[PDB]
Amino acid sequence: SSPSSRRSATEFRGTTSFASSRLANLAYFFSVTGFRSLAKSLIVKTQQLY
Amino acid sequence: LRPTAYGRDVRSIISQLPVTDVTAQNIQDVQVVERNMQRIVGVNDDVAGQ
Structure with a gap:
């Protein structure tokens, strides 16, 4: 649905719902792999060091 | 027509030079840039x- 020929509302929401999906999957990867690591590390230090 | 040309055909004697601008389509190109x-x-x- 990236092709546009006079899109109506459901149609409009539909291609964008779909286009975002490949970007959201990247985010999910980033979140699990590296953001998580950082976050867990910060949590350990705040608890032990302070 | 002058006396020396009294019997000539009128169409032949004078005409307007035809001119065209070939650079007039640069507009589609402007829109892309x-x-x-x-x-x-x-x-x-x-x-x-x-």
């Missing part, structure tokens, strides 16, 4: 959106 400019700056950009 402008769209490309919106893409680099990102002020009103085609990308992110269908």
Whole structure:
């Protein structure tokens, strides 16, 4: 649905719902792999060091 | 017609030179470059959106 020929509302929401999906999957990867690591590390230090 | 040309055919004697501007289609090209400019700056950009 990236092709546009006079899109109506459901149609409009539909291609964008779909286009975002490949970007959201990247985010999910980033979140699990590296953001998580950082976050867990910060949590350990705040608890032990302070 | 002058006396020396009294019997000549009128159509033959005078005519207007035909001219055309071949550089008049540069307008389609302007429109492309402008769209490309919106893409680099990102002020009103085609990308992110269908």
